[PDB]
A paper describes a structure:
The HIV-1 Env is a trimer of gp120-gp41 heterodimers that are heavily shielded from the host immune systems by N-linked glycosylation and further protected from neutralization by conformational masking and considerable sequence variability. A glycosylated region near the base of the third variable loop (V3) of HIV-1 Env forms a supersite of vulnerability that is targeted by antibodies originating from diverse germline genes in multiple HIV-1 infected individuals. Here, we determine structures of antibodies in complex with HIV-1 Envelope for all observed members and ancestral states of the broadly neutralizing HIV-1 V3-glycan targeting DH270 antibody clonal B cell lineage. Here we used cryo-EM to visualize the interactions of a complete inferred DH270 clonal tree with the co-evolving virus Env.
The next stage of development in the I3 clade of the DH270 clone led to the most substantial gains in Env binding affinity and HIV-1 neutralization breadth. The I3 intermediate splits into the I2 intermediate and the mature DH270.1 antibody, both of which acquire mutations that are primarily focused on the LCDR3 region. A notable feature in the cryo-EM reconstruction of the I2-Env complex is the well-resolved V1 loop with an altered configuration. Well-resolved density was also observed for the V1 loop N137-glycan, which contacted the I2 heavy chain S84R mutation site. Re-orientation of the V1 loop shifted R57 toward the V3 GDIK motif, resulting in its interaction with D325. This V1 loop orientation was similar to the UCA-bound trimer structure with a kink in the loop introduced to accommodate R57. Similar mutations occur in the I2 intermediate, most notably an F101C mutation spatially adjacent to the LCDR3 base that results in the formation of an additional disulfide bond in the antibody between residues 91 and 101. A considerable number of mutations in and affecting LCDR3 were also a part of the minDH270 construct and have distinct effects on epitope interaction in the I2 intermediate bound structure. These included the VL Y93F, A94G, and S97A that work in concert with VH G110Y to cause a rearrangement in the LCDR3 region, creating a pocket in which the N301 GlcNac-1 N-acetyl moiety rests. An important impact of the improbable HCDR3 G110Y mutation in creating this pocket is the shifting of the F93 rotamer via steric occlusion.
Author numbering:
A (entry chain K): 196 to 248
B (entry chain K): 84 to 135
C (entry chain F): 34 to 139, 150 to 185, 185a, 185b, 186 to 309, 312 to 321, 321c, 322 to 354, ...
D (entry chain G), E (entry chain B), F (entry chain L): 512 to 547, 569 to 664
Write the structure that this text describes.
Amino acid sequence: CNTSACTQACPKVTFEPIPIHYCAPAGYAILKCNDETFNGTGPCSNVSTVQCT
Amino acid sequence: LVLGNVTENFNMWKNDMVDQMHEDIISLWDQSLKPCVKLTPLCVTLICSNAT
Amino acid sequence: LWVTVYYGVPVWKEAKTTLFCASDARAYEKEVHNVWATHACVPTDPSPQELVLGNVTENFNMWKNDMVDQMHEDIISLWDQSLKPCVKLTPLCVTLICSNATVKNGTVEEMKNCSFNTTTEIRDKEKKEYALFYKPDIVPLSETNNTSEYRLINCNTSACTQACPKVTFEPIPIHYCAPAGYAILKCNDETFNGTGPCSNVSTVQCTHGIRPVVSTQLLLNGSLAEKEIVIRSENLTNNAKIIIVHLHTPVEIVCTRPNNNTRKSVRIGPGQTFYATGDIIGDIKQAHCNISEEKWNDTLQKVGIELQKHFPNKTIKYNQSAGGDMEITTHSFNCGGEFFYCNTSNLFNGTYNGTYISTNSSANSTSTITLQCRIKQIINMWQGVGRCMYAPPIAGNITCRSNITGLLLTRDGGTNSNETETFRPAGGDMRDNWRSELYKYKVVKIEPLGVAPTRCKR
Amino acid sequence: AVGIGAVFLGFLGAAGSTMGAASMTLTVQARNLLSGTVWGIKQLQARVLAVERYLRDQQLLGIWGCSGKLICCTNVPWNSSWSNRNLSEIWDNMTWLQWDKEISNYTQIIYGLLEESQNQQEKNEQDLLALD
Amino acid sequence: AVGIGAVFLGFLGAAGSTMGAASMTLTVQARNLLSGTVWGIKQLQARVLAVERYLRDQQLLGIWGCSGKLICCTNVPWNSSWSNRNLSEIWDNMTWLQWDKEISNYTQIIYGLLEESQNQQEKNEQDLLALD
Amino acid sequence: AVGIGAVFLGFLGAAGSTMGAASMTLTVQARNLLSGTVWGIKQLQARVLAVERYLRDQQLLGIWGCSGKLICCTNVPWNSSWSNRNLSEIWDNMTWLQWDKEISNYTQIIYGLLEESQNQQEKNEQDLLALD
Ligand SMILES: *[C@@H]1O[C@H](CO)[C@@H](O[C@@H]2O[C@H](CO)[C@@H](O[C@@H]3O[C@H](CO[C@H]4O[C@H](CO[C@H]5O[C@H](CO)[C@@H](O)[C@H](O)[C@@H]5O)[C@@H](O)[C@H](O[C@H]5O[C@H](CO)[C@@H](O)[C@H](O)[C@@H]5O)[C@@H]4O)[C@@H](O)[C@H](O)[C@@H]3O)[C@H](O)[C@H]2NC(C)=O)[C@H](O)[C@H]1NC(C)=O
Ligand SMILES: *[C@@H]1O[C@H](CO)[C@@H](O[C@@H]2O[C@H](CO)[C@@H](O[C@@H]3O[C@H](CO[C@H]4O[C@H](CO[C@H]5O[C@H](CO)[C@@H](O)[C@H](O)[C@@H]5O)[C@@H](O)[C@H](O)[C@@H]4O)[C@@H](O)[C@H](O)[C@@H]3O)[C@H](O)[C@H]2NC(C)=O)[C@H](O)[C@H]1NC(C)=O
Ligand SMILES: *[C@@H]1O[C@H](CO)[C@@H](O[C@@H]2O[C@H](CO)[C@@H](O)[C@H](O)[C@H]2NC(C)=O)[C@H](O)[C@H]1NC(C)=O
Ligand SMILES: *[C@@H]1O[C@H](CO)[C@@H](O[C@@H]2O[C@H](CO)[C@@H](O)[C@H](O)[C@H]2NC(C)=O)[C@H](O)[C@H]1NC(C)=O
C-alpha cells in the first residue's frame, strides 16, 4: 500500500516447474554442444542438431 | 542427430535464448495473475495483538 | 496472332490497404514508451529512394483519400493505447472547497486554491490536501446555499485519466509505408492544387516524415510549398468547406508561460500519485504568444492576392472567429506539455483592396502582435478515445518557438452582394491538419499479370 | 538458358515506356513483391497480404503452362474483336498502363477463353509417352 | 502445352465419377486452394492455414520433378502387392475417393520408395551437360 | 530425371562432408523448411516466418530459371578473382560451410552479375518461336 497493490495468487493454479522445451521455427535449427569438458565459451568439436531442447 | 567433422563456436554470456526465456517467464507469470483477486480492501489499519 | 501472358507488368489500380509506420533510427536510442514511434515502428532508411518515372500522367485527389482517415484512426487508437497504464484518478470527484488563491498578498484571476479531502493509501483514513486549479477546470457544484464549494469539470460525463509524466507529447515524424505488392505515388508538381491530373509522378515506398501536430486555426511546423502560396478547397463555391492555405514562407510564432509554477505530488490510493500545481514562486504574469506584425501583414496581403485569383473583382476581408466554446474559437495547441488556447482576434483583423503595400517605411521593424492565451489541464480531446485526459503540470516557466506554415480559413455566408466576402479561422475536425500534409501521396495496388497478342505460338 | 536477372531501373521505372521496353524490366516488378518487418497487429496482416496475393499470381501461371516469371506464349487464338489493332501499333508506341485500360474489360473472358482444360494436353503428352 | 485453364464443373463435381473422368477437371481442385477475407484473430489463422497447406503440396511435387499442377508420371517400379489389379479395372470404374482407401495405407512407403535418389539424377543431367 | 526424393541422413547430416557429398542430400535441407502448430501470438510469427523466408528462396531460383529445388548450372562466366582455386581442390576436400565463408563476401556482386539478362533471352526464345 506504500508502493503497489498485491494480487492474491489463485489457489487453483500451481507453482510446479513443469519442464519446457524451447524449439526453433521452420528454417532454423538448434545446435547442441556435446563436449563433456565444455566450459561454456569457445569452440565445440562435437556438435549435434536438434529441433526442441 | 550427431553431425560430421563440424567445429562450432558456442557462448553463454551473450546468448539470446536466456533473455527471451526470462521475458517469456515474466510475461507468462504476469498473464497467470490477471483473473485473480487484486485484494485492495486489505489496506485498512490492522490492529495486531500478540498471537498467543 | 495468339494471346500471350506477361508477369511483372507495371499496371496500377488504386485500392485500400493497411499502411504501416516507419521512424528514424535515433529515436530508438531512447527508452521504450517515451513516444509511440520508437516503441514498435520499423527503422526507416534512405535506401528506398525517390524514383522519378517516365511519361506517366496520374490523377490525384485529397478530399476522398484513405490515408488521412487511416492516419486519424491510428492516432486516435495509439493515443488511446498510451493512456491505458496511467492513473485513472477517480477519488478526485470529491467536493472541492475553493477559496481565492491569493499568491503572496494578492489574488490571481485564473487559479483557485481548492482544498479537498483525499483518501490516502489506507482506505479508512483521509487527509486534507490542497492544489491550485485553473478556472476552466472548475465548475460550481450546485444551486445550494454555498458559493465556496466547487467541482471538477468532469464527473458529470466521464472520468479522466491523468497523462503519465514519463511519456511525451513531442511530434516525432511518422513515415507511412505501403506493404509489398503496393506502391506510393508522389505528385511532384509545384503548382499542384490537390485535385486533378499530375504530370510529374514518382514512386516511393515510405512517405516523408509527417509531424502529427494537433492544432486548430493555424498549422504549425508543417511542410512548405515550393514556389507559391497554394490555396486548396474541395469546392470554393460552397461556404462550408475549410479553405486550407499553404504558405511558401513560414511565420515564426513564439509562445510562453512566464509565471514560475511548481509541481506537488498527492498520493491517491496505493502506490499511484496525482500531480498538481503548488505555489507560484515569483510574480504573476500573462501567458502569451508573439507574432511579428510586418511579416504577418505581408503574409495576409499575399493570401489576399492568391485569394483574389479566385475572386477577381472583390476585395478580401479577414474577420475574427465565430465564437462559442473556448476550445472551438481559440488557437488550441500544445506548448511543450501545457495546452494553450490563444485568442486570435488581433491576427485576423484587416482587409486587402488589390494594391500591395511593401513592408518598408515601417513604424518599427520590431513591432509584434501579442495574443493572450488561457491554459487548460482537463483536455476533452476527442471522441471514442477515452474522451478526456488530465495533463499534469510542468515546473518552471515554459517557452516554445515554432513556424506557421498553413492556415484554415472559412468564408462567411453569401449576403448583401458583398464586395469583401470575409474569412474567419476554423477548426474542430483534426483530419484537415493531416490532410494538408498527405496531399502529394496516393497508394496503388500492382497488378503484374498482363495479356498481349503476338506472333508466338507454343 | 542463362541464370541471371533484372535491370537497374528500379521498381516502376519502365512505366510510361513502350510495350517493347516494358517487355524488358519484367524481372524487377516480379522481384519486389515480398518483404518482411514488424509493427504489430496492424502490420502482421500487411505481411500476409503480400503472400496471399503473390501465390495467386503463382496459381494462374502455374496453370497456363508458364510456371514462372517470364514471357509465356500460348496457342490459343486471339479473337480480333478484343483490340482490332495490328502488332506494330500496339508494341512500339502504347504503354502497358494504357493497354490495360483497353484490355481489362475483356481480361475476364480472355482468362475465360484460357479455360476448360490444360489438363487434356497434360494427357496428350502422356499419350505420347504411355501409348507412343 | 496449351494456354487454357479450368473447366466449369465446380469444386468437387468430378467426385463420384471414374478415375479417367477425374483425371480431367484436376485444374478446378487445383484452382480453389487459396482465398482471403477478414474476421479477426479466429479467421487470421484461417488465412495462414490456407498457405501452410498449399506450399506443402508445392514442396513434394517440386521434390519429385513434377513442379506444377499436372499429370506427373515417374519411373519408380510399381510393386504388385500394393493393388494387385490391372489398369482397366482401376481406371474405368473406380473413383479416386475409393482408390485412396486402398492406397493410403501404402502412400507413406510409396514416398518411402520415392525416397532415396532424385538428386543423383539431377547430377546425372549435370554429368550429361558437363562431361558430355 | 527420376521420380524419387530425399535421403535418410536427416536435416544436417551432410554438414562437415565434402562438396561432392553435400551435392547429394540437398533435398532434405529443402524439405524441412515448412511446418505448422500453435502456441499463440508468439508462435504465429514462427508460422509466417517459415513462409516469408521460404518463398524468397523460391523467388531467386525462379528469377534465374532454375525453378525448383535442384542443381542449376548457368553460363555466366566465373571471374577467377572470386576463389583463385581449381575444381578438384574445391569439390573433393572443402565443406559448403567453409566455402560460404570465402564466397559470401562476393555473393552480393555475384548476384549482381546474376542481374542483367534473363528477360532478353525470354524475348530471344520468343523470337526463335515466332520469327523462326
Ligand atoms: C486471534 O485473535 C482472535 C480475535 O481477534 C481470537 O478469537 C477470539 O478468541 C477468544 C478466546 O478464545 C474468544 O473469546 C472467548 O469466547 C468464548 C465463547 O465460547 C463459547 O461460544 C462459542 C461460540 O462463539 C460465540 O461466542 C463468542 C463470544 O461471545 C462470539 O464472539 C462468537 O462470534 C460466537 O457467537 C462456542 O462454540 C463454545 O462452545 C464450545 O466450547 C465448549 C467449552 O468451552 C464446549 O463444551 C462446546 O462443546 C463447544 O465446543 C463456547 O460455548 C467465551 O465464553 C469467553 O468468555 C471468551 O470471550 C473470542 O470469541 C474469539 N473471537 C473470534 C472472533 O473468534 C483468536 O482466538 C486468536 N487466535 C490466536 C491463535 O491467537
Ligand atoms: C492555498 O491554501 C492552503 C490551505 O488550503 C494554504 O496553506 C496554508 O497556508 C497558511 C498561510 O501561510 C498556513 O498557515 C500559517 O502557518 C504558520 C506556520 O508556520 C510555522 O510552521 C511551519 C511548518 O508548518 C506547520 O504548522 C502549520 C500551522 O500549524 C501546520 O498547518 C502545518 O501542517 C505544519 O505542521 C514552519 O516551516 C515555519 O517555519 C513556521 O515556524 C502559522 O504560524 C500561521 O499562523 C498560519 O497558521 C498553513 O499552514 C498552510 N497549510 C497547509 C496545509 O499548507 C496555501 O498557503 C494557499 N496557497 C496559495 C498560493 O494561496
Ligand atoms: C498581506 O496582507 C496580510 C493582511 O493584511 C498581512 O498579514 C497580516 O497583516 C495584519 C495587518 O496588516 C496583521 O494583523 C497580521 O499579524 C498579519 N498576519 C500575518 C500572518 O502576517 C501580510 O503581512 C501581508 N503580506 C504578505 C507578504 O503576506
Ligand atoms: C525563464 O525566464 C528567463 C528570464 O525571464 C528566460 O531567460 C531568457 O531566455 C531567452 C530565450 O530566448 C534569452 O533570450 C534571454 O537572454 C534569457 N534571459 C533573460 C534575462 O531574459 C528563460 O529562458 C525562461 N525559461 C525557459 C525554459 O524558457
